[model samples]
Target: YSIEADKKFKYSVKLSDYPTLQDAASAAVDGLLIDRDYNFYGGETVDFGGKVLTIECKAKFIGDGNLIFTKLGKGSRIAGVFMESTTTPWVIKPWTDDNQWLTDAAAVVATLKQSKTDGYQPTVSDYVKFPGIETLLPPNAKGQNITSTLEIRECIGVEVHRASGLMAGFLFRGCHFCKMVDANNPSGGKDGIITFENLSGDWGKGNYVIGGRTSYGSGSSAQFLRNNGGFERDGGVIGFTSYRAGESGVKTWQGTVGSTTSRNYNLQFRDSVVIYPVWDGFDLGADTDRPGDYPITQYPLHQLPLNHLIDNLLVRGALGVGFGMDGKGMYVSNITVEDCAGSGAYLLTHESVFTNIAIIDTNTKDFQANQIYISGACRVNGLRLIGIRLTIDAPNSTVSGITGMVDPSRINVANLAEEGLGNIRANSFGYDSAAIKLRIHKLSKTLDSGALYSHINGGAGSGSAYTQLTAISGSTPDAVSLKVNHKDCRGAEIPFVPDIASDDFIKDSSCFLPYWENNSTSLKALVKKPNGELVRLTLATL
Candidate 1:
């Protein structure tokens, strides 16, 4: 009984006892806890041997390496760890061979180079090998219950590959990642600092990056966060801030396979700010050839990304477009773009609803830096713009509930076209089915040329008979009536008023009328006289 009283028990292993973190991890058993109290230095990859373990690290891990956990078991966790490399970079490497795709793609390039052929391009099968979700999950792993809280500096951060089922329950809380570099390969491939690749199925839902900061990346092709392929659903970046990325800030790309385009659903980017991105702040769309995948004969409704929500997103100082979307069925609200060198927002999506969106001080030197640029048969509502130009170039597009101010002096005059300054330019060229409706209220601005211009033109060709521009205001209940005020302009309008019963008035003309609001009886109209002058006339009924 006296000998038995001297026995001691240990619940976890100290990482300082082992030669390296990898050695400690290799020696760990299931449900073992690995505790670290001091800083460690190594550049070799550490594999957890696919077991459930808790690593409580209180000190920094300084290395140019990676930590890999393949087939992560349930209840595995890593918390309060600071991983950094002042000289190089580290990462929580993905489950698959990260370089295999690049190697295969290089082989294809070699073949093409030897043959010296044209019109032959690589297909999806040439390099991509999608991993199975089952291979990433341990048999004991349940839904999404794993988590990590880490601060990674000069690193690539975490990567989740084909493991959305096991990762849905995983939460990354209050992590800060900075100065992320690309993979140390010959050619840096398209990889994000935090990447989710080829995720599908019900288990592929809810991998949220909540309350984090990612900044100062050196990868030109890599984003701050990216969803690369497949139909990932119900996941998003929430309450995050990304700054000074070498490339885009956040993106969701759906690649194509054969005739089917991959899509994402219910993805959300909420309460986030992306600043000083070299590329677009946010880019969401399918990376497919549009004419090939979506022909006129085929309505590619299934190819579009759906049910996405972008709420309270502020993007500033983007070298590219602030927010560029090519998806559909998105609900966007309270988005603000400031001083972007490209278009404040370039939207090609259809059937999307937007509210309280503002664009300020878009660069004038860039030809593409319109305050708001819309195309591709889109139907967007609720926009509040405060920059230079609004260009609606697509046929059969509708922009409703728009109110904006234009200041041409905000941009440089070197690249500003005559039609680019303080104008709403809508064009329906070579499309007979094109009909545009613009609903605005109190949309007032100043033009340097002293003339207010609305250039809504329909090209003269077959099917152009159906092209028309209908401007309506005060159509909704509690809506204020339309007011188009051009303040302090020095030039004549030179307006061309078509005959009331002429074909020009029916086809290629814009007419503004006030709809009844709250039982008010008043007719407010902006009419152009034969002498090329604009006059506001109001008739009130008492």
Candidate 2:
């Protein structure tokens, strides 16, 4: 028997001396593959303590590079074999004691190795999934948190638990990191803004990081993220260098809508500059010196969720704000932008807030696109723009040269949509062309009967008009919910009839019919009654 011909010393144990791999099927319950006193030193009667885990751990010169929670038996704890019992956990620190690095966090009823709360070394199982006690809760969290790095095999994908935060952060899936989670969502909370600090590496191009529905995407389980790339802090400026990288970027959406809200939404791109894919164009911000140069686009389709579909929606054309105008104000405000496959920045809010955030779409050889538009639903305060230039570089069908949602009640020209920003018909029959498409509007609301009417100021302060405009002061039988309608508009705009409280006009459903029309110098509206009576309404300028 030539020992030299053997496999090696590590494998040289006698077949009889070392337990065979199949000895694990032993008839005697003699401890099987584990030492009965695995937690003890010399000897002792081990009770029904220590759990049987499916996990298999190995030792390294530096021990496993992780926070290991090895439960010390009462005997070991008395002998200092365990620094402290799990019930009383403390930082074991990187002490040379037994030459092991033990993590120090609060001890629990048992032991734990949580990493989701503390930024600790991650494992495949952590990202993918693992058995045993699956519910993870961050300390001081009223909600569930996931943290574990269980080893997941390659070629096999992994997924992370759905998590949320008060502000910007990230979610990791296996080796990939996604920045800006629900980063710029605008409910009462601007919560969907995910930042780069929440991710790893500069993912400029050559990589496609998109958001999709996880297993828990239905109902209140949808995940939202927004990656507004760049950095600003300590009054200094720094950002993703990949902005200079010329590679095209792409992000796609995947999921189903659970709620359909009636709120008119918008994606404001202050900077509205160079977008990815090299195909869908963009608008540029005017203030080139400010952070106004970046944009999170909004998809124009009403069917898309105001949150999920915006970030990854690709662009089809480009909106170019003339030189200098980069972003909208309050400069720190989180702007709503949905990435789309089109051109032009839909000016959801202020044209002045964005120096150069407008993309004029056209069908020119160089600038061909399906269409480009700029619009907004809120900002009742109105906005102004000077030298607000727009351009598109695609070849497509038509372009929204101009558009606005000006409330007629607030039309103080200078305060509302100023002059120059009006209806314009541009004929860009060829390339190298330029002009504005002006769409003028005297703002009003669409009651049940689409009739256009202005807001009644009721003389500003509290008075007879205020009481009548708001409600008829009283209770119960006297108390009523005023809903102004087309008849009210007719009453307010009629050339004849005694004056009545605008509040009296705010009535129930039967008194209105919806109407919408576009024309300058005059707004045409009417309340059509079931009795065949037509009350003509016109909110003409005083």
Candidate 3:
């Protein structure tokens, strides 16, 4: 029945002689004195014996609830449509011809079609989503167009995939997602952002996840980018910021450890910044908990976490960029981590190259360790830093321009083993690329204990003035520590070249021989020349 124009009418789907609700809504005839309010009040559905359930119509015709839209005939217009969680999928593409009001924001939420459609690209600018909706769509031509983009103004999440079960080139831009969590306990829940996840398969390449940011509402620790299974392709996560995440700002992982098909390669996170994360800022890896299985010599992914094992336990304060636990071939550059509760960037991944990393005011909480922490087996090519305020507890790791402030209790160099050949060991003072300069200034809380240094390895705040004094006067209990070589000079041990302390003194074969001190009645000074001439001298007793 066709409804006449300008007449107030109310039609109930279940209050008619129809087979189903669809039939009752479609067969809605006008010109009857219908009680619009009695049947449907504020999106509520009235049950009339349940034959045709009250659904999906209001103001004009009240009913049960479904998003299904019926043909209201040509020349008619629908002002609004509503549906509940239990509602079925509805279609509205046919109204694009003319009569229906059109909009861009609501257009993308519901499916649509317009051939010569003209509208500015979806620039949601800003919005937030809390438990909105997340579902996947088919990719390529057989499926929906991947070019379809959405601007989330605080919407929770959206996961769409390709027909071949891979992800297309989507710009998941301009959205904010927050996981409202308890302040005291952050590790109790699983919270994160954009995910292209499949347990059995690897992620397809090149989906630009640019712009937008995520932060907590109540301001506790929330996990961000916890998408932990897939092959990380090029153009992964870039130009994004995560503030105060409870777990990790950015964590992308591949297959489980030891699985042959597990591949998380070709990832580049450039110019991305994470601030004050609860755990590590950029937590990129597969397995983080198990340390014993590290240096999994065979699998590159399994080596990242254990590659450079130091104090191998997880800490409370947030880490800047932690690359470990079965990670491989990731290139990160131009990252700034400041005021971190824990270490800035802890790297354990093999074949991973990092450049221009800055850590400031790190380990402020002193949660245990701070500055830039590296593992014993880390083999990164260029992990450069401007300076660190506190300590760097990397026992045997390689980095560049790594200078820092020192605390008395934390000052000491240990014997570090070679990268490929772990059996061959050297002191941590090796910067084989260039000459070293170090100045040691120390004071002890407990009296009777004090130390001084001129150069340490190749880095120094102290100069050769002290090193010169030590060579002439200072003597240790061990003759093996004869300071024959000047604090300055000599070219030996290329690449991880050693300083005069370890390179010249520690090695017995060097020309740096010892000077003697005697307490016996017989005193003598013996000097040996290189030309096989032994010069003997006598010491006068005072």
Angstrom error at residue 270, model 3? 2.0
Candidate 2 segments exceeding 4 Å error = 1-238, 241-276, 281-342, 346-363, 366-371, 374-416, 419-542
lDDT of 1: 0.44
TM per candidate: 0.51, 0.21, 0.42
State candidate 3's TM-score: 0.42
lDDT of 3 by residue, 130-227 (tens): 01212211121111211211111112222221100011011122222211111111111112334332223333334334444544211112122212
lDDT of 3: 0.34
Q: Write the number of the candidate with greater TM-score, choosing between 2 and 3.
A: 3
By summed lDDT, the worst window of 10 consecutive residues in model 1 runs over 161-170
Q: Model 3 Cα RMSD, Å?
A: 18.9
Which candidate has the highest TM-score of all? Answer: 1
Ranking by TM-score: 1, 3, 2
